[PDB]
Amino acid sequence: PLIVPYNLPLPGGVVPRMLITILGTVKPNANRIALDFQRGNDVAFHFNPRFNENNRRVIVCNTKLDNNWGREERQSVFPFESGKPFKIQVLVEPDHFKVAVNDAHLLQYNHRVKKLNEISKLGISGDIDLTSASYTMI
Ligand SMILES: CO[C@@H]1[C@@H](n2cc(-c3cc(F)c(F)c(F)c3)nn2)[C@@H](O)[C@@H](CO)O[C@@H]1Cc1cn(C2CCN(C(=O)NC(C)(C)C)CC2)nn1
């Protein structure tokens, strides 16, 4: 297993057709998970499954600029299950990040941070056993 929280370097930032694959297992009583695609201290793309927000499950996505969170984008389609092995794939496209979980399309997030070449770290945190974190070009 990998340490959680985990830092995955993205050397020279991200580019279209870069596919980031995160494999792990959701903890049995999971409350939260977060991916943070970072440009220095800024978070270009925060992907945040919440397992118990007002007694429902929701995906929250956002951007953090100068330590300020922006407007949230929310998705009630919630593919994660407590205790189960998962795969998150984030595909970088010219105008958005595309996320698929367990080989099913989940959501798209339009680029707010435009310096893709400076998004040089992925943070992985929360209620998971993390097995691997890697990237390839499709
Ligand atoms: C609790 O802090 C989370 C952030 N967070 C979570 C984590 C974390 C760490 C881990 F270690 C980990 F393992 C994990 F799973 C998650 N770290 N930070 C972050 O998720 C943020 C994502 O907006 O929401 C809140 C903070 C926040 C949110 N907001 C505003 C943003 C604009 N909003 C909005 O537009 N609302 C409408 C859509 C209804 C119009 C209202 C709410 N202001 N501050």
Side-chain angles (χ1 to χ4, degrees), residues 1-120 122-138:
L2 300 178
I3 186 163
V4 180
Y6 190 78
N7 172 54
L8 177 68
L10 307 172
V14 302
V15 294
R17 303 182 291 280
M18 189 171 178
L19 179 67
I20 303 94
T21 298
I22 306 308
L23 290 162
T25 298
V26 180
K27 288 189 177 298
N29 292 105
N31 178 81
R32 65 184 190 168
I33 301 170
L35 303 181
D36 290 282
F37 289 86
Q38 297 217 200
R39 174 175 173 254
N41 182 62
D42 283 357
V43 183
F45 178 39
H46 176 78
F47 171 88
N48 173 216
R50 300 182 182 181
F51 287 77
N52 187 12
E53 187 192 69
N54 186 218
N55 299 118
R56 62 208 67 186
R57 310 192 301 167
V58 62
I59 313 289
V60 179
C61 295
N62 207 350
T63 292
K64 198 186 200 180
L65 301 174
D66 294 336
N67 242 32
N68 302 131
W69 288 106
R71 180 63 54 239
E72 290 176 351
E73 297 181 36
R74 284 158 165 276
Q75 166 65 287
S76 290
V77 173
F78 192 94
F80 301 94
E81 295 295 330
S82 296
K84 297 199 196 187
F86 70 87
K87 177 172 70 175
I88 304 167
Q89 291 180 302
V90 182
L91 180 58
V92 182
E93 287 184 354
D95 278 340
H96 55 251
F97 295 95
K98 181 167 278 164
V99 181
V101 175
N102 302 338
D103 294 308
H105 174 67
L106 180 60
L107 62 80
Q108 290 181 185
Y109 187 88
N110 291 333
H111 294 307
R112 302 187 192 173
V113 171
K114 298 193 187 283
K115 291 181 180 190
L116 305 179
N117 72 301
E118 295 187 0
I119 303 171
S120 301
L122 169 62
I124 307 161
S125 57
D127 299 335
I128 62 168
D129 175 8
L130 179 61
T131 303
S132 66
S134 66
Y135 42 75
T136 192
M137 301 296 178
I138 68 165

